[PDB]
Structures are given as C-alpha cells and as structure tokens.
Design an enzyme around this catalytic site. Structure first.
Site, PDB file in Angstrom:
ATOM      1  N   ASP A  39       0.847  -1.202   0.000  1.00  0.00           N
ATOM      2  CA  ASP A  39       0.000   0.000   0.000  1.00  0.00           C
ATOM      3  C   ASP A  39       0.884   1.255   0.000  1.00  0.00           C
ATOM      4  O   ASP A  39       1.970   1.222  -0.577  1.00  0.00           O
ATOM      5  CB  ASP A  39      -0.985  -0.068   1.200  1.00  0.00           C
ATOM      6  CG  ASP A  39      -2.283   0.678   0.953  1.00  0.00           C
ATOM      7  OD1 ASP A  39      -3.331  -0.010   0.900  1.00  0.00           O
ATOM      8  OD2 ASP A  39      -2.269   1.938   0.871  1.00  0.00           O
ATOM      9  N   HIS A  69      -3.675   6.004   3.750  1.00  0.00           N
ATOM     10  CA  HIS A  69      -4.441   4.822   3.306  1.00  0.00           C
ATOM     11  C   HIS A  69      -3.803   3.521   3.837  1.00  0.00           C
ATOM     12  O   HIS A  69      -4.492   2.665   4.404  1.00  0.00           O
ATOM     13  CB  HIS A  69      -4.485   4.820   1.772  1.00  0.00           C
ATOM     14  CG  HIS A  69      -5.351   3.758   1.167  1.00  0.00           C
ATOM     15  ND1 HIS A  69      -4.852   2.542   0.753  1.00  0.00           N
ATOM     16  CD2 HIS A  69      -6.670   3.753   0.848  1.00  0.00           C
ATOM     17  CE1 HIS A  69      -5.824   1.832   0.208  1.00  0.00           C
ATOM     18  NE2 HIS A  69      -6.940   2.542   0.258  1.00  0.00           N
ATOM     19  N   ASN A 161     -14.085  -0.232  -6.368  1.00  0.00           N
ATOM     20  CA  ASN A 161     -15.137   0.660  -5.899  1.00  0.00           C
ATOM     21  C   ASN A 161     -15.958   1.289  -7.030  1.00  0.00           C
ATOM     22  O   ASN A 161     -16.364   2.450  -6.928  1.00  0.00           O
ATOM     23  CB  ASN A 161     -14.527   1.779  -5.054  1.00  0.00           C
ATOM     24  CG  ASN A 161     -13.883   1.280  -3.761  1.00  0.00           C
ATOM     25  OD1 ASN A 161     -14.147   0.184  -3.278  1.00  0.00           O
ATOM     26  ND2 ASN A 161     -13.044   2.126  -3.179  1.00  0.00           N
ATOM     27  N   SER A 224     -11.290  -1.192  -0.065  1.00  0.00           N
ATOM     28  CA  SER A 224      -9.962  -1.074   0.563  1.00  0.00           C
ATOM     29  C   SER A 224     -10.014  -1.359   2.065  1.00  0.00           C
ATOM     30  O   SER A 224      -9.030  -1.824   2.635  1.00  0.00           O
ATOM     31  CB  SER A 224      -9.402   0.343   0.366  1.00  0.00           C
ATOM     32  OG  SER A 224      -8.821   0.468  -0.929  1.00  0.00           O
TER      33      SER A 224
HETATM   34  C1  LIG Z   1     -11.331   1.281 -10.818  1.00  0.00           C
HETATM   35  N1  LIG Z   1     -10.571   0.537  -9.810  1.00  0.00           N
HETATM   36  C2  LIG Z   1      -9.885  -0.709 -10.125  1.00  0.00           C
HETATM   37  C3  LIG Z   1     -10.485   1.001  -8.527  1.00  0.00           C
HETATM   38  C4  LIG Z   1     -11.094   2.152  -8.119  1.00  0.00           C
HETATM   39  C5  LIG Z   1     -11.056   2.684  -6.832  1.00  0.00           C
HETATM   40  C6  LIG Z   1     -10.376   2.152  -5.773  1.00  0.00           C
HETATM   41  C7  LIG Z   1     -10.402   2.659  -4.391  1.00  0.00           C
HETATM   42  N2  LIG Z   1      -9.430   2.156  -3.480  1.00  0.00           N
HETATM   43  C8  LIG Z   1     -11.048   3.964  -4.091  1.00  0.00           C
HETATM   44  C9  LIG Z   1     -11.794   4.720  -4.953  1.00  0.00           C
HETATM   45  C10 LIG Z   1     -12.486   5.887  -4.612  1.00  0.00           C
HETATM   46  C11 LIG Z   1     -12.448   6.517  -3.395  1.00  0.00           C
HETATM   47  N3  LIG Z   1     -13.137   7.688  -3.179  1.00  0.00           N
HETATM   48  C12 LIG Z   1     -13.073   8.260  -1.842  1.00  0.00           C
HETATM   49  C13 LIG Z   1     -13.835   8.363  -4.280  1.00  0.00           C
HETATM   50  C14 LIG Z   1     -11.748   5.724  -2.484  1.00  0.00           C
HETATM   51  C15 LIG Z   1     -11.097   4.509  -2.820  1.00  0.00           C
HETATM   52  C16 LIG Z   1      -9.771   0.977  -6.135  1.00  0.00           C
HETATM   53  C17 LIG Z   1      -9.820   0.441  -7.438  1.00  0.00           C
END
Ligand SMILES: CN(C)c1ccc(C(N)c2ccc(N(C)C)cc2)cc1
Ligand SMILES: [Ca+2]
Ligand SMILES: [Ca+2]
Length: 279
Positions: A39, A69, A161, A224
C-alpha cells in the site's frame, strides 16, 4: 476475549447478526502470523501498533506513509483498538505514492518482493498479504497475484469501488486469490462495491474507523477497508490452526454468514466473513 464498544466492523465479523457492539475473539489474536500490507506504507510509530509494525521495502524516495491509506488498512488488520488480529506482525511495502497512485510495474515488483522476503522472516503460523488497490484489467498484474498466492501466501485483494463487475479489474479478477467486496452496518452491499462471480467473500467496508497518519484516527469507506478485515481474519484463523494459506479463502467462505446481505446481484456470492468464535 471481548472488546466492548468495538468499531462496528469488528463486532460484525464476530456475530451472526448486525447491530452488536462487542468484538469477541480468541486471545491468541494472530500471534505468530505475519501480514504484509502492500500500500502507501505504514506509520510504524503509531502507538496503536505497539511496535508490531515495520516498513520492509519502499519503491519511492522514502518509506514514510505520507497519505494515510496504508496506515488505515494496517490498523484494520492488526492495531490494538481497530484490528482484527491484535497480536499479528505487520510488514509495510510501499508500492503506492503519497497520492495513492502507482504504476503496474511497481505493484508487480512489490508482490514478487513479498514472495521472496517471507523466506527471511519468522512467521511460524503463516503469511498473509493484503492488497487494497487495483485498476483496469491486466493479465500481468493477475499473474503476479497468482504467483504470490502460489508461493504460500494468503492473498486478499479489494474487489474495487466502481459498482461494476470485478471481472474487468485487477488484481480483483484473478480467480486464485481472495477477492473481497464491501458491506455496510445494515448488511447491505456497500453502494460502491464491485460485484460479480469472481468475488469470494464480503467484509465490512462502509464507515470503518482505523488508524491514520500523525498518530490519529479516521473513518473512511471502500473495498480497501473490507480487504484488511479478511486478511486479519485469515491470520487469526491460521494462528488457531483452522486453515492454511492455501485454503484460507475457501475456509472463510465455507464458515461465512450466508444469505445475510441485501442488494447482492444474482451470480454474486451472499457470504459475509465470520470468525465463528464460541467462548
Ligand atoms: C477502478 N478501480 C480498479 C479502482 C477504483 C477505486 C479504488 C479505491 N481504493 C477507491 C476509490 C475511490 C475513493 N473515493 C473516496 C472516491 C476511495 C477509494 C480501487 C480500485
Ligand atoms: Ca445472520
Ligand atoms: Ca477467488
């Protein structure tokens, strides 16, 4: 053991029902297991890790978590107050920069690193890797996750997400690892959680209180946050001798709370991580 007024996620993983506030767990608490958190790094000096955390590798100028994070995820695995496996040891691998971004080549290198590094560590009860990251489909990223799993490490990865089918995301789409979706405190699929047939298990992911940089705490949401619940639970179960790195994802699914979740699309598992603790 019991932790009163626990964060809701911890309570949920030790209950057959939502709405409880006590986290019940065996005192062994993942002692003798090791979890790599791959991470943005880990603030190892946070009082909540009690000296059980250390940075082992960085792919950037510093090993410091300048984002938060990685420290949050690590806290859910193994911090005293916010952690599933409260006596595990934590190793930080910084493959993400302080903006939370990273190239696929760096992420792959971090996974190969762990597969080798674990051979230099004393982890008698087994090794887990928690990957709260992902991006668009990549066969080479999937292959790196598959290798890490093959090498004898329990690999837990976030589903993503995007409120979409996780088949188009990596390393979420690698079948051989443990792909984790997110739920909220009312037992609904989190509104952002990816879904699909590649998901193995759900864990608490909405409004998760954990450690943060500057010796602080905060609540954030995502797949996450669900992933380290499952990684922590794996370490916990391996320490108890209930399962091995190779079979932990299947054991967790086998012993999960079944059918409790709402807003699960047809074709996606209705399984919520559960520790089966009986005092
Ligand atoms: C598209 N993809 C593989 C992906 C997208 C988002 C994340 C993610 N850790 C994330 C996305 C958005 C937000 N916010 C707060 C919009 C927080 C974490 C992980 C993978
Ligand atoms: Ca139930
Ligand atoms: Ca799988």
């Amino acid at each position: 053991a019991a932790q009163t007024n626990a964060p809701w996620g911890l309570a949920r993983i030790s209950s057959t029902s939502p709405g409880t506030s006590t986290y019940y767990y065996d005192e062994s608490a993942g002692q003798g297991s090791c979890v790599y958190v791959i991470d943005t790094g880990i603030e190892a000096s946070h009082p909540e890790f009690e000296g059980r955390a250390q940075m082992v590798k960085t792919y950037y100028y510093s090993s410091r978590d300048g984002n938060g994070h990685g420290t949050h995820c690590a806290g859910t695995v193994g911090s005293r107050t916010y952690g599933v496996a409260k006596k595990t040891q934590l190793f930080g691998v910084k493959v993400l920069d302080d903006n939370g971004s990273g190239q696929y080549s760096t992420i792959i290198a971090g996974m190969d690193f762990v597969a080798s590094d674990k051979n230099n560590r004393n982890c008698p009860k087994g090794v887990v890797a928690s990957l709260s990251l992902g991006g668009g489909y990549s066969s080479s990223v999937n292959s790196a996750a598959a290798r890490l799993q093959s090498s004898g490490v329990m690999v837990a990865v976030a589903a993503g997400n995007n409120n979409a089918d996780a088949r188009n995301y990596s390393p979420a789409s690698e079948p051989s690892v443990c792909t984790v979706g997110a739920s909220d405190r009312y037992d609904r699929r989190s509104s952002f959680s990816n879904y699909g047939s590649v998901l193995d298990i759900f864990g608490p992911g909405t409004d998760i209180l954990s450690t943060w940089i500057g010796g602080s705490t905060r609540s954030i949401s995502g797949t996450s946050m669900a992933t380290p619940h499952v990684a922590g639970l794996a370490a916990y179960l391996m320490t108890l001798g209930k399962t091995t790195a190779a079979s932990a994802c299947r054991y967790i699914a086998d012993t999960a709370n079944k059918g409790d979740l709402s807003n699960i699309p047809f074709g996606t598992v209705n399984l919520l991580a559960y520790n089966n603790y009986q005092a």
